[PDB]
């Protein structure tokens, strides 16, 4: 029984910032590790950013290695992606994704390795 919600999307300039969040409500006591994907126009959906269970370790794929930061806190159950240097290629809709079993050596990449998702938010980037 666990729930995502994401948030955080909407319009920004190119050049700019935005955060998106995901909360999670499990009464377990398990801290999920979390996932954000993305869906470009026209473009498969794909990994973006991972993170475990305590943040120790995380993973972004493309140029979210450079732009982006994926963290998280564990005092309200809630991850967060923080996108720089916003451009029109990462409009999208975003997602974010949940399993209970954390990683260290090697990251959860498949969509298939995360049965929670949230509903998508979408971003618009516009010059
Ligand atoms: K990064």
């Known amino acids: 029984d666990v729930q995502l919600q994401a948030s955080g999307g909407g319009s920004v300039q190119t050049g700019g910032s935005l955060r998106l969040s995901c909360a999670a409500s499990?009464?377990?006591?398990?801290?999920?590790?979390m996932a954000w994907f993305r869906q470009v126009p026209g473009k498969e959906r794909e990994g973006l950013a991972f993170?475990?269970?305590?943040?120790?370790?995380?993973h972004y794929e493309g140029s979210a290695k450079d732009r982006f930061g994926i963290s998280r806190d564990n005092a309200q159950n809630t991850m967060y992606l923080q996108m720089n240097g916003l451009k029109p290629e990462d409009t999208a809709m975003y997602y974010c994704?949940?399993?209970?079993?954390?990683?260290?050596?090697?990251?959860?990449?498949?969509?298939?390795?995360?049965?929670?998702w949230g509903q998508g938010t979408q971003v618009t980037v516009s010059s």
């Open positions: 499990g009464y377990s006591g398990s801290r999920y590790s």
């Open positions: 993170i475990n269970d305590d943040g120790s370790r995380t």
């Open positions: 994704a949940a399993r209970e079993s954390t990683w260290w050596i090697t990251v959860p990449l498949g969509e298939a390795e995360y049965p929670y």
